[model samples]
Target: SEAAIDACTGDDVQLANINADSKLINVYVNKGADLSKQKLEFVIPEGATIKINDQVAGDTEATYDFSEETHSRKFTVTSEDGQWKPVYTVKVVLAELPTSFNFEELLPSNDYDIFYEFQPGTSQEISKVLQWSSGNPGFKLTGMANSKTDYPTVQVANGFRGKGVKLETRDTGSFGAMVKMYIAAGNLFIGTFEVGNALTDPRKATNFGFQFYKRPKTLKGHYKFKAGDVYSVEGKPQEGVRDKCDIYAVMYEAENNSVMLNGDDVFTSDKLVSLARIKPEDVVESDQWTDFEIPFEPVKGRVIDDTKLKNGKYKLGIVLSSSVDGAYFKGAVGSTLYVDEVELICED
Candidate 1:
């Protein structure tokens, strides 16, 4: 049961995170529409056979009706050599792009705190819920945290309003030093986290962005930041240098959702349509909330494509970090950032 699916695709299918470790694939399709003949494709090992619902799959492709079955579907793959076989579950959900956040809905996920925003549909039904992703799950691997609240990302009651998000840079303990991952900077983002790669390839682990067709007009939010006292890298202290927090948003074009911008290129990707980042001058050491607003400026002569926008070809990322270079394991421990009332004012 070690073999896994590499990716999934289909027409108008914005494939979400296909985590191989868990063998779970969650994808996004049109909202509340008939999916009787949705063309689905998979990329697996070079020599493998896939069966969907025990029915022999196509040449790595098939059609499934997700209209009636609102639960996760099943897929099984057998290695060509017949040595390995694995089962995967797919959740095809109908969802809409979320706009506002109070940063209140915090839930326990794998023993760590994860934030989620809900889309209350037309009826009493909960249409969709977008759960924020973070490196907490990966941090759990170190066994350094005593409780869920000890994680980098947490929920606080004394927010700018009801509840808010608190991100802090934390020490990963001695085990982290063994692997050169001295610390983890608390962060929150709109994307997925590959727990499997959390250690081997952390940059790839933090898969950024999600299928979002609408262009964001601006990112407005409230934040309170306090730079940590000591700055260090890999256990060595840096003199006269202080840690800096990061808060930004990005809109980019993607061929498909199967591949998302990770920590490495979340900001530098050429496919970017626009980007917005909170300024250093605006975010000073503050015990009180700092209200900020920044526009998504078009990048590299790339404008939002009308057809692509309608086709769900654009991906969006909203990111908040206690340390700007947290992805690289370079930041001061104890740097904290609290956020509330964040929103992406969308374009019509």
Candidate 2:
């Protein structure tokens, strides 16, 4: 009889990127043998990116594609045990940027004994200390940097070049950017920032703000605050260009429901909040951002929905008003702000 051929059979392999980013995932033979003996399969996750370099087992000399955003990469490996089994397994994680993305260090409750510290920043300067204050005083700025009365700042020197803000990390646990925030009552607190010059040094004033913190239940209704509606300190409107310095204040309040950036009732509220306290003059430009105290208290007469506000957690966002488009220091061409602090208070 002719020599009989033998077929391989064992287990059906499945794979996935367990990491948050879902960048790279690995698969290998459970036994110390070449992967040529088995078929491998992979599944993709949502909002994740990845790349691959090797597919075939035993072919260590194969070239692999290393790219991001492009769906899946697969390989087939079939090898038999010659003398001893060569076991192998691959590792998977979300792909991440290698550029030196920066993250601020978190301050200790001991040193910065307060509820929050709006992270501060300067137009062209880096290295700014950050701190916070107690809740009894409401979400107020009662802290300062080493020698400067204003707060310290972070370097977000990207004009019209901000990718919002979020915690980031990589696979292998080899490297990870810093995560600086406190999560309580489901709310997220962190200092955010952006940098860019405006149109006319100080002439092209504009409205700039972080969206996620504007208010709870931002998904409903629409109410553009009248000129006086926005709390402007010292009546200072956005003023600055690539040279001239200016700051602008803008806020939005919504009902307690799913808060979408462009959703209905996004900012219009019948309830009038006490803006007499938060003024526009508070922000210390070139080195500081005033502490924007947003509240979660119920409106006196106007009733806001309570479903969305129940979690009390919020996403972080940034928006710039007219004229400056993307300017920070100047109301014009190109300037920026070092977002120093943001305080979210939970009153009984």
Report the C-alpha lDDT of model 1 over 1-348, residue by residue, as the tens digit: 335687786654533567768888877664533466567788887778887764333222346765554546788898887887688988876776577877777643457787877666786543555678899998898888888889999888872278888899999988888878888999998888888998888889987777776779999988899988888977788877678999999998978656588898887888888999877766688877778889999887789999988887888889999999878888899999988779889887
Model 1 worst lDDT run, 10 consecutive residues: 53-62
TM-score of model 2 (CA atoms): 0.26
Summarize candidate 2's per-residue lDDT along 228-320 as a digit string, tens digits. 112111223333322212222223342431222221121333322211122234323332123444333333443323443333223222222
lDDT of 2: 0.23
- Tell me each candidate's TM-score: 0.77, 0.26
Question: All models: lDDT?
Answer: 0.79, 0.23
Instruction: Report model 1's TM-score to 2 decimal places.
Output: 0.77
Best by TM-score: 1
